[PDB]
Amino acid sequence: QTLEQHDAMKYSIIVAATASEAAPLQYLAPFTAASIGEWFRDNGKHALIVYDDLSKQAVAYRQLSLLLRRPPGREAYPGDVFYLHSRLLERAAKLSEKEGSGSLTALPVIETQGGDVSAYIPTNVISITDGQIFLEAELFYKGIRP
Amino acid sequence: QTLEQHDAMKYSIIVAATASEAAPLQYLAPFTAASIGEWFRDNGKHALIVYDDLSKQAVAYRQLSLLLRRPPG
Amino acid sequence: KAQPTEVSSILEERIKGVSDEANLNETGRVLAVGDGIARVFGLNNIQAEELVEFSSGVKGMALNLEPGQVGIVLFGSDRLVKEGELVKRTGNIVDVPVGPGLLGRVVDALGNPIDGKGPIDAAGRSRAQVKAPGILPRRSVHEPVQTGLKAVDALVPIGRGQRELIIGDRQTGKTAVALDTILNQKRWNNGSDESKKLYCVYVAVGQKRSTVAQLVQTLEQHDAMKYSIIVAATASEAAPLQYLAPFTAASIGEWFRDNGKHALIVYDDLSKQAVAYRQLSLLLRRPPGREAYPGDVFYLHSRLLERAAKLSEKEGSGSLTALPVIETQGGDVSAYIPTNVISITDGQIFLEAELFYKGIRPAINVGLSVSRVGSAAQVKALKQVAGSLKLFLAQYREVAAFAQFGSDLDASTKQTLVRGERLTQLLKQNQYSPLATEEQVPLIYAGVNGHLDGIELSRIGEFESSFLSYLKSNHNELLTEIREKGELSKELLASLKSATESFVAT
Amino acid sequence: STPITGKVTAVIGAIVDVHFEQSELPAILNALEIKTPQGKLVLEVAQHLGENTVRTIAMDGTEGLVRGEKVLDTGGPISVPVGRETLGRIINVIGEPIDERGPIKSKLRKPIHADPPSFAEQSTSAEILETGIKVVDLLAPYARGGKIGLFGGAGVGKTVFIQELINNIAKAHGGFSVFTGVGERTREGNDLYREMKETGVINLEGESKVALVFGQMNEPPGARARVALTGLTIAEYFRDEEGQDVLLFIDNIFRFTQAGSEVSALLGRIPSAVGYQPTLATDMGLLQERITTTKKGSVTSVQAVYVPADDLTDPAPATTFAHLDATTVLSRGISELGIYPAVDPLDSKSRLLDAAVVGQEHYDVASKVQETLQTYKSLQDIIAILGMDELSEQDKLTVERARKIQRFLSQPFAVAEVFTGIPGKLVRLKDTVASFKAVLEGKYDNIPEHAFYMVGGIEDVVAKAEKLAAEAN
Amino acid sequence: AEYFRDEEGQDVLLFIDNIFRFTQAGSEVSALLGRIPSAVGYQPTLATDMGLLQERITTTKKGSVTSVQAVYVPADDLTDPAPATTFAHLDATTVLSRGISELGIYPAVDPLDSKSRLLD
Amino acid sequence: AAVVGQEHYDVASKVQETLQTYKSLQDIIAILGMDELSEQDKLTVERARKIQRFLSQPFAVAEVFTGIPGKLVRLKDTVASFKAVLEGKYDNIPEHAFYMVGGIEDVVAKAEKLAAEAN
Amino acid sequence: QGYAAEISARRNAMDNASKNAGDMINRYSILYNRTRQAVITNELVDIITGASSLG
């Protein structure tokens, strides 16, 4: 409704796989939307993809590979969960003039806990990506918005 | 002996599953004294019970669940 | 030339002679190799901790036995032991060559020499898992181990049979204390009396190859390799070698212990041995304890360090003295590993990082480093002229944080502050220059009795070599008196006071 | 000829179970192939479950594997093409180039799980590797065949620093470079490749001086736990065959420790303390102890460190720091003063800054430099507070000398000739020690501070002194 | 609540207290049903079960549902994943805090961390 | 109080009160220093640090570490000694003279020793 | 003159406060790191412990 009232729905594709739905939908929804982004990327355009978030996505992947009896590691996440996110975020790129100069640009979101970057998922995503727009509550209550 | 000094043995019921005894006594003895208290409660009297101390009962219940091969939490 | 081929052909005769009697009441197939350990079917007459040999040269120890199969841990990379191979059993509990012929050699954990100087002239084999000597053939320690450092023999003395710990941090000068002690034993290893010689067995676990290479090169520069034994278990090689190598070196030490001679051993460093042991107990599903060292890791360093004490006259008055080295994490003395080595050894030499950051090398923190049965076995002379020195450094440590306020004070704290700074700058020492007790007595003697107080603080480092050469050129008879007697009588004390005040006057 | 063909029985993520028919089994760490429509899919046997059944970790994506496909064996470990033809060719951990410059016509194919060199061959006196950058060869000299911890995040000229090392080892010792990005970000992988073309260290037509091995992030963890070994074997063939002194660059060794964690947590081994794999010391040693100095040649390694959560009791830096001979910090507060390179002097300390190895004169000069910059740093607050009137002649000369040294540390780069245009000065060691010695004496105090910025040696110091004397009059 | 929503067409109040007992009662048997226990000690089926209980309480276009769910937090520790999942599922989160009840002021609404959505 | 006597119990309660006051004020001492207290509590901290160094006792078995012969101090002298230091009879004695001592008589004697030495 | 004496002694007191704060931060960072490592290990233990006592 907010994207209707400002009319960004002309060019927006929402992929909702909300918490009502089961765990493999939440495991697959970023990759599904990644292929949707790659269709624009192979066609000389510019697609801003925004995952929101990737914490819940890792929680669903944790629920899969703990119920699937794969052995867990740190904070009971599975082993190859880095290989999850590193297979996702690296699907964004900037193609050459030989291919057609298509481009996908990725903005994932990590809901951290209590002001932390020492947790396992934020450590992995910071080791992947290109920096932070690190947002804080303490700067929010001064009224500095965003 | 202290309750015999100040003379409270007239209305005292000690249920002491001490650490000399096995682990399901330490798991069970609060519920046995709970039944002892409910006899006074279902007859219109008034009973004060004191369990002491529940971390030992949690220790015994941990011992019973581990030795019977249940996945601990 | 062909002379090693002659020797190897004689060994071929032994191999061909062994092939004429080879009937291996043992062999079994390798069911599964996984987690760096092998499961073997067959071998229905094997022993607990019996050495076996796979068909690729990698030996192994059979550490657990089950109805159905036997679990054998490896002694190398598992790249060689293949599924379905052939497992002869050797016949032995895990043994190593011991005897005097290892002096000069560099072996790894199973007596295979890797220096390139031929086979080990081996005077016998001995078990790795020897029961420690019980409480009856023990004597409390009464002989000095002169380390040659100034501050060690000043403050924290080491007895023959006193297990002392060198604890410290990373790159903070831990190995240099043990290396200087081994180089100090050159005073008696050149000599003739056996009961004053002191053989050094340095047991490098978990370290780099090139570090052990440089350390062998160092012990051949200063000629320690006529009495050194290097047991190397370098971190390229796999984990049960590191679990084993200090134990086999303790068997090497016990060979010198039972045979009357005296011998020093240096474990360096057991905080990597407990790394190798938590690797071997987290690949066999044994559940971890506090900080994931497995629950028996106290027992490991126990059964290691308890094979070292002073035998009494009933067994031959031999000895074995151990210096384990523990790498802590950032000045910590309360992780789970360094609170198990401390609860075995008879004291600590806590090489704190902050003092080495100020360059005071070696960086013994005096107020923490203490020894429990050191005091009954110091050289008599130092015990006569340093009975104030521990209490005086405690006194100086009391006013350490009180003088940081910058406040003007009385005369007594200024006197003790100047003498304490002169003693702190006094106990420095360069690498590879251990000072014998015959020269440790006069320097400490000049430190105690206020003679240094007129000197500026920077001259003290050259005051050391100047006052030593002053005593070497002129009062040589006093150094011979301290050498022979080992004790300062009243006349010796007065002559020493004259010889101080002479050179102190200029 | 006589193939060892079995069936894939189980695909679990990056773990693959392969059944073999009887009396055929290869041992641990042997390369297995699976032919796909997309190419080949390599496996490395890591555990034998018995039952003629092995369990491997993946080396590429394991989507779409029908269980029951034929499993071809190659007997040995993961083969890599080595030698001269590998230069300038981006090889992944498999052994195939990915730059699309055709197949690599290399002469041999080497295993990667080789033995480390035996104890009789370890070189028994670690000399000093003359790198070429001044502040390296003065303060924290790199051990010849030793290990070097290069800290600091990107954007402080770290790639400029490492290309400068490439050019200076190409000039002075003539050695080649093998770069290896374990876990390297793919985008900055391509940016590093383009920049290494344009700086001249990769010539697509002539003779390039580097071999790239980029184990990308989107490979399964069994790849990243061997990419460093691939770069290591390409180093070892240049060491023990052609006899050189080769620089092995590894970025970033903490991602290699992550690869170890996830491989030995996918295999079902119990995890250790903090959560790194319990084979931590051994699977760091099998990477460290193959980087050493034999009597033939040597491989010196520059490997970065991502310190986790800015903490140095975490076992992955606390295990790497039991191996590193010399650290080198590229800090922020040094490039912020516009200094190229940004080798911070007070922090980058070596275990081979010792007079018994570098000589007495070098150690004396370096010790006075460290105490000079130490006193400068301890004065830098009251310089702003009180001004240069509280300085005595004991002190104001030290402030002047330390400003002279701090400007003098910067060096014109062999790669910043398209950046700044000043041609690079490869400074020898015997010029460097004498130059810093003469500045520590006081023989050039009359020289102004501005003539010490981006200078090669003391001779170009004199030349720039005369040129700025001429431009001022 | 659903029957008064759909088949009645009416404003429906729902004063659930407490919701943490639901996930905790998931934990008290999910150890024993043969699930590998997840992080801190809760079940693996957490986000899906908290999802299926926090999605059938919503305002459809057949009726209005106003939910008030009191939610326990263990040991005043909001980084626990069992109340932290609920943060994504609510619109007006009044966050109490024992550190304000220590000052005796009641009710101890922490006036910073209690954000909401209707503060446009 | 009904087991060891009322005086003993009151002395023990006062000593634990003073040492608890010290352990509570530990942090402000660590940050700023002793100078930023009140004037009752600064006397409390000083008497607490007297009583800590007075709690030391040269053991008959640890004689070789400290060089002091053993001290077997009976109960009643200890009770009277702590009662005396609590009542403030000795507040001007330097702190180091309390250290590694037997009873209060040896505190007076050792303070006299250090008085004759420092002068 | 007492004003300048006050401000000099107060400056010295705040200098000692800044130095002691730096030192005790260098203690509590070590306690923080040991607490974090002990907490991650002492929850990974009780994740793993469930994964071996299965049916």
Ligand SMILES: Nc1ncnc2c1ncn2[C@@H]1O[C@H](COP(=O)(O)OP(=O)(O)OP(=O)(O)O)[C@@H](O)[C@H]1O
């Ligand atoms: N007396 C000394 N003179 C000169 N250098 C010294 C002295 N003592 C220590 N060092 C320096 O300490 C450094 C490390 O020595 P040492 O190996 O003992 O430290 P360490 O913590 O044991 O290192 P590791 O634990 O890796 O063996 C050496 O580079 C050496 O130069």
